[PDB]
Amino acid sequence: GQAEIARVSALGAAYRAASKSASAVTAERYNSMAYGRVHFAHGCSYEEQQFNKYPAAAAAMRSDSYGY
Amino acid sequence: QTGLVNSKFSARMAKKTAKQTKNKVDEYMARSVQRQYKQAAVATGVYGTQCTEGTVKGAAEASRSAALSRQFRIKQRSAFSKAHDLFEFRKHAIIAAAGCSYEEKMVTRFPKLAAAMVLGQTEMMRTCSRYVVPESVEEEYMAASVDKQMKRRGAPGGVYSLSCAEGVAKGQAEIARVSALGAAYRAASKSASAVTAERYNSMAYGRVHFAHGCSYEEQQFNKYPAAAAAMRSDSYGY
Amino acid sequence: MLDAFSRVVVNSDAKAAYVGGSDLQALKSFIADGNKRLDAVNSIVSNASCMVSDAVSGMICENPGLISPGGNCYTNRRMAACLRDGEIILRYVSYALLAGDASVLEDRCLNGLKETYIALGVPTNSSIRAVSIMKAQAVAFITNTATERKMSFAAGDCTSLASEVASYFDRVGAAIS
Amino acid sequence: MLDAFSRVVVNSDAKAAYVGGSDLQALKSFIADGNKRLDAVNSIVSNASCMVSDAVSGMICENPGLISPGGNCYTNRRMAACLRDGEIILRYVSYALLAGDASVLEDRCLNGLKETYIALGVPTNSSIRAVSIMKAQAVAFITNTATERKMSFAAGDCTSLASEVASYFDRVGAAIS
Amino acid sequence: MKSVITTVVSAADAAGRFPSNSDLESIQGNIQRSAARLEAAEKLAGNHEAVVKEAGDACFAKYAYLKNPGEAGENQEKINKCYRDVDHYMRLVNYCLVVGGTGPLDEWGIAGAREVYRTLNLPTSAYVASIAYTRDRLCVPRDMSAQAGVEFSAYLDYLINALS
Amino acid sequence: MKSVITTVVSAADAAGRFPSNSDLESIQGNIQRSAARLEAAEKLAGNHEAVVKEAGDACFAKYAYLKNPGEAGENQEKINKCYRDVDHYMRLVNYCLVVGGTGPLDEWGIAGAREVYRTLNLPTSAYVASIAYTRDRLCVPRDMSAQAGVEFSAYLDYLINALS
Amino acid sequence: MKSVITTVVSAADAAGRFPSNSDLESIQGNIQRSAARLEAAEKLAGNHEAVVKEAGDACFAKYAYLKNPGEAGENQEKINKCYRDVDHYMRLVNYCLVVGGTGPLDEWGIAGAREVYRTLNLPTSAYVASIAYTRDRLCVPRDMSAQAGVEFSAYLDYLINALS
Amino acid sequence: MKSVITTVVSAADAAGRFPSNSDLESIQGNIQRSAARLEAAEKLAGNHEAVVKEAGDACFAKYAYLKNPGEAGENQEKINKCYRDVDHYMRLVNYCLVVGGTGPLDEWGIAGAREVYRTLNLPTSAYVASIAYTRDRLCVPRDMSAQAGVEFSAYLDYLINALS
Numbered sequence A: 001g002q003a004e005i006a007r008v009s010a011l012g013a014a015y016r017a018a019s020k021s022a023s024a025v026t027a028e029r030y031n032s033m034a035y036g037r038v039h040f041a042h043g044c045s046y047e048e049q050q051f052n053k054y055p056a057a058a059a060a061m062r063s064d065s066y067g068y
Numbered sequence B: 001q002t003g004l005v006n007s008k009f010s011a012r013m014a015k016k017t018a019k020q021t022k023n024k025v026d027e028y029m030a031r032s033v034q035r036q037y038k039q040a041a042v043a044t045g046v047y048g049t050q051c052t053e054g055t056v057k058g059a060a061e062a063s064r065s066a067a068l069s070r071q072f073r074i075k076q077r078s079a080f081s082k083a084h085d086l087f088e089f090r091k092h093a094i095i096a097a098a099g100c101s102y103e104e105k106m107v108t109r110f111p112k113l114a115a116a117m118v119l120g121q122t123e124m125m126r127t128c129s130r131y132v133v134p135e136s137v138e139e140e141y142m143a144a145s146v147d148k149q150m151k152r153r154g155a156p157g158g159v160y161s162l163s164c165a166e167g168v169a170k171g172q173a174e175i176a177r178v179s180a181l182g183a184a185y186r187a188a189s190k191s192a193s194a195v196t197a198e199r200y201n202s203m204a205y206g207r208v209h210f211a212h213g214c215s216y217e218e219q220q221f222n223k224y225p226a227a228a229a230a231m232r233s234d235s236y237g238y
Numbered sequence C, D: 001m002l003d004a005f006s007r008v009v010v011n012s013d014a015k016a017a018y019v020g021g022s023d024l025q026a027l028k029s030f031i032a033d034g035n036k037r038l039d040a041v042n043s044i045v046s047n048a049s050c051m052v053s054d055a056v057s058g059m060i061c062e063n064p065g066l067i068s069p070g071g072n073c074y075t076n077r078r079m080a081a082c083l084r085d086g087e088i089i090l091r092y093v094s095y096a097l098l099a100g101d102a103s104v105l106e107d108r109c110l111n112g113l114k115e116t117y118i119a120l121g122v123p124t125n126s127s128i129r130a131v132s133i134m135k136a137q138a139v140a141f142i143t144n145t146a147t148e149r150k151m152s153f154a155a156g157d158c159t160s161l162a163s164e165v166a167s168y169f170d171r172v173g174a175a176i177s
Numbered sequence E, F, G, H: 001m002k003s004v005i006t007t008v009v010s011a012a013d014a015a016g017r018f019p020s021n022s023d024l025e026s027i028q029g030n031i032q033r034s035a036a037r038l039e040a041a042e043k044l045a046g047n048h049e050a051v052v053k054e055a056g057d058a059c060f061a062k063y064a065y066l067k068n069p070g071e072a073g074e075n076q077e078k079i080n081k082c083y084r085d086v087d088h089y090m091r092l093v094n095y096c097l098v099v100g101g102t103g104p105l106d107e108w109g110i111a112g113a114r115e116v117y118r119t120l121n122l123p124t125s126a127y128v129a130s131i132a133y134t135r136d137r138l139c140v141p142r143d144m145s146a147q148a149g150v151e152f153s154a155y156l157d158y159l160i161n162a163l164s
């Protein structure tokens, strides 16, 4: 049952992130681009040019030893 | 965490994107223009005979049925027929707003506003087919051949398109027949000050929208303005 | 519009009479040489572009005043309108030949054409000479008596279809006169 | 729009390939049982009015909440719109069956219908149950397995046309889902 | 008057095109069918006293309430004008067997049908009862051939679907 | 793509009507012709190396002025792209023999034809010379049957009338 | 929803005009009538079990042919859904007595009425029989007042004229 | 000519509808008001020499600059035509008290008003000064009743709002 509780809790958080303020959706929009560009791009001028267009793809990458 | 990969059960995108509140501007812009264009038919408070839907008891509800599947058919268009609409509606919306470079940008950003402007302005100054009656059989053949050529784009290549559809259930084409038959009587029976008001803006409308300096076509439209009223643009269909 | 099948129905509806074998044998004869009719119309669609060229240039070849300055077929804009009109008339005559009835020729083409040409100043005499040349070409193409081009077919008689299209062409001529 | 003859032409034009007897035998087979297709479509036009009244009333017979106050098929205005929409869908499926191709079903009917019903609040589940009942009626009328009415025909097999219309109906169902 | 030739000529005329091989193709379809859909017009033309008598009283057998005083079919000329209407409808079916099209049914019996029978209280179920009776009174090998039996019934069920 | 079924389905759809006996009638016309207009597609499909070679040089035989330097058909790839065009046109004729319609000729070779050959200086008389040569090189009892010879020539003369 | 205020506000809005003395005048007409057309809504609201029972079986008394097997009103839920419909129609009449307008009759019972009863074979004469019975079962000094009796019957005969 | 009946008849005619209970309701509003808005037309009809004399010189008292040579109201016939205009405007107010509508004000004094006074240099403030003076010279219990005093002033302030 615990995976189901963690399901429903992760399902509510997705609604809460899709419903926040207009000043915070465009604040998390920019530091995501910057975060991906410094932590993972490292001068590869394609990957920056992908992260600027699409920063949710920049936010969706972790480091290696986080797992999952 | 997305609806695609194997992690999630069918709940996503609970938010306003920049799509939808773009399109809700064009909704309101089309409606606040149809208001101002219908506000010329009801000038002093009485409803004029132009803005009468039905004459049978259930002709108005059936015209609402016909007019709701009308603009659903506009949504059932190909991508080649999506794109061909706005790039000539923008052309023709420039011709409506002669000066006023405010309106030149106003009709150029918004896409359902310019479609409403070119049909509300011809409904407002009464330059349609079904409002002008030929003063002689002379103009009747003139306007017959314009209707012949203008319905060629409604059946392109031998096949009919949905844009020429006339009813979607049985009996509905007959209701739309009788409703179009009453409107022709009502247009042939109006005031003497309105038959010669629709006579002039028809000449002017044809001359600016379709003649474009061809000194023959003006010289045809001045003699015969029901032939000028009987020509549409391309992406109206029918 | 009507065709050959519809005109007996319209004629019998004004009697309140059922149609039977009193007049269905004419329709069965329309059916039996109906393949001759499809052999007939195709010879005009095959040579439709040469027919207007041979007709409208022959009109000027017999009347050089149409291209004198001021004439009806004088300038480059008016020549295109006349070459367009000739092919429109040929298209409607081919419609009436395929239909077996001159209903589509009357209302969509000839209804209101005479005083349209009167208001435009189009001379009727040259127009009549333009349709009659096309009639002479059509009756030569139907019977395969064309001197310049011959086609392939099954052998037999086709004067019925040649006569039908000959009756359609001066029906066009009588309306614009 | 396209039909069965046009789709091989569209498919072969993107090869720059001439069509021949590599794939004309499929079209000749489309021709040979083409009279079976005309026997097939006529059974749906004969019973088109009963099909929508057996479909839409069965939809409520399995779901009484559509006519609860507030429901989609609740009032007298909305019932007419739903009975109209069912017959429109049946009309386009009959177009696609006569054409031998689902091109006319896509663009003129199904292109933009799903989010049209989403914007109107039309429940999709009841709509799917409405098209599927009509599918079950159509496959019974094609094969003459209808329990209430039988028709006259020449004997033989018609599962290919029954399968074509069965593939058209859940093609309608997949687009509005 | 939608026949098979009116369909192709107006389609070629809307596009401004000469009659091509598409348009020539449709006319031979009005050669192979039309050898045998005109024998149904023979069967309908010589038998029309009996088939509108046999179908004229079928609706009154189903709906005997019409003959009541104050009801719809009150007096004798009511019934005479009703048999007139059944004769008119079978005449249009006889026309449609001859054009190869539903044109004479459409623009002479079907267009504006619902806006008469509603305002005059003529029940359309009584109209479809006679045509439905005539549709199943026909058995194929006695009255006509196989090609004629399907095409005669197809114009009947088209009017049945159009009337209600 | 005007075939015989696209003509009737869109005509029924513009009126909001079910497919009636008119629409069913047109399809059997695509049964009686179409047994023998597809043998012309066999004759065109296996012989297309030779019939576009024999017609490809017929226009250069009539119009030898094209091969001049500075003229229209200057170098070798001019002639290669010209033979490509004759192959493309005979492919659309082969398609039109198979649909039973002029659709694939129209929307793939005829629509927008005049607005290319004028701006690129391709003379349309050189295009109609090859098709006219192919029209009279055919004699009926050697290459195909009688039904095939008329319908193969009818799609050729339709394109001849459309190109000029 | 054509009430007396929806009529004048939209008429002033189509002209772009403020509400003038014409528009203010129409509202006091909804003061003098509306003191007594709402007592008819009291009479209809507390008596609606009996007036749709008394009118529900009047159509079956006139039209006993409906209850036959294979006929229109075959089984028991047929009759239950028919009494449901008579209740729905008298509810819209009760609404129309309250708005002072024919709006709730129009857009909830009258719009699209004819395109249901024809395709489902519901005879509209059976619908107008109940409403006509309810129109003459009312006598004025027993059930309501004089102002209420005319305005209650006027919404009934409006629906009678609209249904047929 | 927007009266209370022209508003409802054209609204019923645009929809193709018979005059229903909405349309009948608006006319009794022209019964309860119209017993007392016509006494204002009595007060205006017998007193119109004095009320346009008293208001005619009020604008010249406020705007004495008009009477200068070279200015707007130069000579005597200027003043005569100005008093003519005040008489014309009070006549249209007298008409509007009688129709129960602003129609005769609109299409006879208000439509095209601004496109005359601008091109002829007639100052609209001088026009609204007389009507504003007439609006507050009226006190209710001496000249008319209470129902008449509000409806006479309402047609005056409507023209005041329309002129500027």
Ligand SMILES: C=CC1=C(C)[C@@H](Cc2[nH]c(/C=C3N=C(/C=C4\NC(=O)[C@H](C)[C@H]4CC)C(C)=C\3CCC(=O)O)c(CCC(=O)O)c2C)NC1=O
Pocket: B029, B030, B032, B033, B036, B037, B039, B097, B098, B099, B100, B101, B102, B103, B106, B107, B113, B117
């Ligand atoms: C929602 C989007 C939206 C727009 C883009 C504008 C477009 C627009 N303007 C006017 C109406 C008008 N538009 C203008 C503006 C101009 N007229 C001119 O002669 C100049 C060329 C031009 C810019 C200076 C004026 C002065 C009027 C009032 C009179 C008139 O129609 O000319 C009307 C008709 C309404 C009416 O007159 O009753 C419309 C649709 N209005 C809108 O509501």
Ligand SMILES: C=CC1=C(C)[C@@H](Cc2[nH]c(/C=C3N=C(/C=C4\NC(=O)[C@H](C)[C@H]4CC)C(C)=C\3CCC(=O)O)c(CCC(=O)O)c2C)NC1=O
Pocket: B145, B148, B216, B220, C056, C066, C072, C073, C077, C078, C079, C081, C082, C083, C085, C086, C088, C089, C108, C109, C113, C116, C120, C122, C123, C126, C127, C130
């Ligand atoms: C549906 C049927 C149908 C037709 C029959 C034509 C009929 C027709 N022809 C012309 C118009 C014309 N028609 C002609 C023709 C001629 N002058 C002659 O002496 C010759 C007899 C003849 C050429 C063979 C000319 C020259 C004009 C143009 C007049 C001008 O600009 O000078 C016009 C006016 C429109 C225009 O200017 O193009 C029309 C409606 N159009 C149709 O839609």
Ligand SMILES: C=CC1=C(C)[C@@H](Cc2[nH]c(/C=C3N=C(/C=C4\NC(=O)[C@H](C)[C@H]4CC)C(C)=C\3CCC(=O)O)c(CCC(=O)O)c2C)NC1=O
Pocket: C047, C050, C051, C053, C054, C057, C058, C060, C061, C062, C132, C133, C136, C137, C140, C141, C145, C146, C147, C148, C149
């Ligand atoms: C300068 C003066 C000049 C002329 C006098 C005419 C010459 C001319 N040729 C024809 C007559 C014709 N014109 C054609 C047309 C054609 N023949 C073909 O086989 C081709 C397919 C197509 C043109 C390419 C046909 C078929 C006839 C009938 C006689 C014949 O078969 O040649 C007629 C009609 C006879 C009549 O009036 O009754 C005329 C007047 N053209 C001119 O330019």
Ligand SMILES: C=CC1=C(C)[C@@H](Cc2[nH]c(/C=C3N=C(/C=C4\NC(=O)[C@H](C)[C@H]4CC)C(C)=C\3CCC(=O)O)c(CCC(=O)O)c2C)NC1=O
Pocket: C032, C033, C035, C036, C038, C039, C040, C042, C142, C143, C144, C153, C154, C155, C156, C157, C158, C161, E021, E024, E025, E028, F033, F146, F147, F150, F151, F154
């Ligand atoms: C779209 C394609 C298509 C066609 C074009 C026609 C093609 C065609 N025509 C004929 C057949 C024929 N065609 C003709 C016609 C003529 N013979 C002549 O000598 C004259 C030149 C011309 C007169 C107009 C005759 C006389 C016959 C044979 C007799 C007949 O068919 O009745 C036949 C033989 C079948 C039959 O006997 O009916 C065919 C297939 N049918 C088609 O399916």
Ligand SMILES: C=CC1=C(C)[C@@H](Cc2[nH]c(/C=C3N=C(/C=C4\NC(=O)[C@H](C)[C@H]4CC)C(C)=C\3CCC(=O)O)c(CCC(=O)O)c2C)NC1=O
Pocket: B065, B068, B069, B070, B072, B073, B168, D056, D066, D072, D073, D077, D078, D079, D081, D082, D083, D085, D086, D088, D089, D108, D109, D113, D116, D120, D122, D123, D126, D127, D130
């Ligand atoms: C060309 C193709 C084509 C279509 C498919 C339809 C699609 C369609 N349906 C509706 C409109 C509608 N459609 C329905 C239907 C239903 N509600 C249900 O739960 C059932 C599943 C279903 C009946 C079987 C209803 C009830 C409305 C009206 C909504 C309302 O007013 O409440 C509308 C809006 C126009 C109108 O209000 O009539 C459109 C465009 N129209 C077309 O032109």
Ligand SMILES: C=CC1=C(C)[C@@H](Cc2[nH]c(/C=C3N=C(/C=C4\NC(=O)[C@H](C)[C@H]4CC)C(C)=C\3CCC(=O)O)c(CCC(=O)O)c2C)NC1=O
Pocket: D047, D050, D051, D054, D057, D058, D060, D061, D062, D132, D133, D136, D137, D140, D141, D145, D146, D147, D148, D149
């Ligand atoms: C109140 C509850 C209620 C129901 C549950 C349904 C009953 C019903 N009937 C059919 C099924 C059908 N309905 C028809 C329709 C007809 N048969 C004919 O011969 C006539 C011509 C025409 C109507 C007059 C046909 C042909 C079938 C297929 C089975 C059969 O042949 O009877 C189906 C489809 C089966 C499925 O879902 O897959 C349902 C649900 N109707 C209701 O009212």
Ligand SMILES: C=CC1=C(C)[C@@H](Cc2[nH]c(/C=C3N=C(/C=C4\NC(=O)[C@H](C)[C@H]4CC)C(C)=C\3CCC(=O)O)c(CCC(=O)O)c2C)NC1=O
Pocket: D032, D033, D035, D036, D038, D039, D040, D042, D142, D143, D144, D153, D154, D155, D156, D157, D158, D161, E033, E146, E147, E150, E151, F021, F024, F025, F028
């Ligand atoms: C518009 C009028 C018109 C039609 C309706 C059809 C009518 C029709 N169908 C068939 C003929 C046939 N029809 C069927 C079809 C069926 N048989 C069954 O058992 C099933 C109920 C059904 C499957 C869908 C079969 C199996 C044949 C005989 C085999 C065949 O024709 O290929 C035939 C005999 C000719 C032939 O053999 O092809 C005819 C005239 N044709 C027309 O011209």
Ligand SMILES: C=CC1=C(C)[C@@H](Cc2[nH]c(/C=C3N=C(/C=C4\NC(=O)[C@H](C)[C@H]4CC)C(C)=C\3CCC(=O)O)c(CCC(=O)O)c2C)NC1=O
Pocket: E059, E066, E072, E073, E074, E077, E078, E079, E081, E082, E083, E084, E085, E088, E089, E108, E109, E116, E120, E122, E123, E126, E127
């Ligand atoms: C050419 C096509 C054509 C038709 C399809 C019919 C359709 C039709 N029927 C009627 C008219 C009628 N139809 C009936 C028939 C009936 N009413 C009854 O009382 C009986 C219950 C029922 C018998 C089934 C009656 C009585 C009239 C006359 C109207 C009347 O008396 O109320 C009328 C009015 C003119 C007339 O009196 O004939 C028309 C146009 N008539 C046509 O000309």
Ligand SMILES: C=CC1=C(C)[C@@H](Cc2[nH]c(/C=C3N=C(/C=C4\NC(=O)[C@H](C)[C@H]4CC)C(C)=C\3CCC(=O)O)c(CCC(=O)O)c2C)NC1=O
Pocket: E043, E044, E047, E050, E051, E054, E134, E137, E138, E139, E140, E141, E142, E143
């Ligand atoms: C043109 C349209 C047309 C029709 C629809 C029929 C309709 C019809 N059927 C019958 C009369 C009959 N028809 C049949 C035929 C049959 N009964 C059956 O049980 C079998 C299923 C079926 C074919 C064997 C029989 C057995 C009778 C005599 C008994 C009766 O009247 O039903 C009669 C009386 C005279 C006669 O027999 O012809 C008529 C006019 N006749 C027509 O002229």
Ligand SMILES: C=CC1=C(C)[C@@H](Cc2[nH]c(/C=C3N=C(/C=C4\NC(=O)[C@H](C)[C@H]4CC)C(C)=C\3CCC(=O)O)c(CCC(=O)O)c2C)NC1=O
Pocket: F059, F066, F072, F073, F074, F077, F078, F079, F081, F082, F083, F084, F085, F088, F089, F108, F109, F116, F120, F122, F123, F126, F127
């Ligand atoms: C599917 C349908 C289809 C067609 C009908 C043709 C039509 C066509 N031809 C050309 C294009 C061409 N056609 C020619 C042919 C000629 N020009 C000459 O120099 C010679 C005189 C003459 C030989 C007869 C040439 C040379 C080009 C290339 C354009 C150029 O080089 O100027 C092009 C431009 C693209 C290309 O290079 O192929 C197209 C679309 N191609 C198609 O794909």
Ligand SMILES: C=CC1=C(C)[C@@H](Cc2[nH]c(/C=C3N=C(/C=C4\NC(=O)[C@H](C)[C@H]4CC)C(C)=C\3CCC(=O)O)c(CCC(=O)O)c2C)NC1=O
Pocket: D057, D060, D067, D073, D074, D075, D076, D077, D079, G059, G066, G072, G073, G074, G077, G078, G079, G081, G082, G083, G084, G085, G088, G089, G108, G109, G116, G120, G122, G123, G126, G127
């Ligand atoms: C809010 C406004 C409103 C109305 C005016 C009515 C109108 C109406 N009636 C019916 C629907 C119906 N009406 C009847 C009634 C009858 N048919 C018979 O068999 C008897 C002869 C007759 C009794 C008089 C029946 C049986 C149905 C269900 C359809 C059917 O079973 O065929 C339906 C379909 C939905 C349903 O089942 O209720 C609607 C919208 N309902 C409404 O909600």
Ligand SMILES: C=CC1=C(C)[C@@H](Cc2[nH]c(/C=C3N=C(/C=C4\NC(=O)[C@H](C)[C@H]4CC)C(C)=C\3CCC(=O)O)c(CCC(=O)O)c2C)NC1=O
Pocket: G043, G044, G047, G050, G051, G054, G134, G137, G138, G139, G140, G141, G142, G143
């Ligand atoms: C809100 C709507 C509404 C109605 C339309 C009536 C309808 C109605 N009438 C009666 C019942 C009755 N109604 C009357 C009244 C009359 N019979 C006559 O002959 C006179 C002309 C007339 C007025 C004196 C009589 C005498 C009875 C008893 C006998 C009967 O049932 O008809 C009953 C049974 C209980 C009762 O009396 O109220 C009902 C519900 N009542 C309502 O609540």
Ligand SMILES: C=CC1=C(C)[C@@H](Cc2[nH]c(/C=C3N=C(/C=C4\NC(=O)[C@H](C)[C@H]4CC)C(C)=C\3CCC(=O)O)c(CCC(=O)O)c2C)NC1=O
Pocket: H059, H066, H072, H073, H074, H077, H078, H079, H081, H082, H083, H084, H085, H088, H089, H108, H109, H116, H120, H122, H123, H126, H127
């Ligand atoms: C039926 C409705 C109706 C009206 C509302 C008025 C409106 C009106 N006033 C004037 C016209 C005028 N109005 C004035 C009045 C004035 N200008 C001055 O010099 C003074 C400052 C000022 C007094 C207040 C004058 C002088 C003219 C004549 C124009 C002129 O001489 O310049 C005219 C031109 C015709 C005329 O001479 O009367 C009209 C239509 N007249 C009407 O018939």
Ligand SMILES: CCC1=C(C)[C@@H](CC2=N/C(=C\c3[nH]c(C[C@@H]4NC(=O)C(C)=C4CC)c(C)c3CCC(=O)O)C(CCC(=O)O)=C2C)NC1=O
Pocket: B038, B039, B041, B042, B047, B050, B051, B052, B053, B060, B061, B063, B064, B067, B068, G001, G002, G006, G007, G010, G014, G106, G107, H010, H011, H012, H014, H015, H017
């Ligand atoms: C879905 C798309 C759509 C339509 C198309 C129309 C069609 C239509 N117009 C109507 C009804 C109608 N129409 C007009 C006139 C018309 N109305 C105006 O507001 C102006 C400025 C008018 C002139 C153009 C009037 C006066 C009425 C009566 C209802 C009212 O507005 O008071 C009615 C109601 C009929 C009835 O109630 O019986 C319909 C169905 N309505 C729609 O909803």
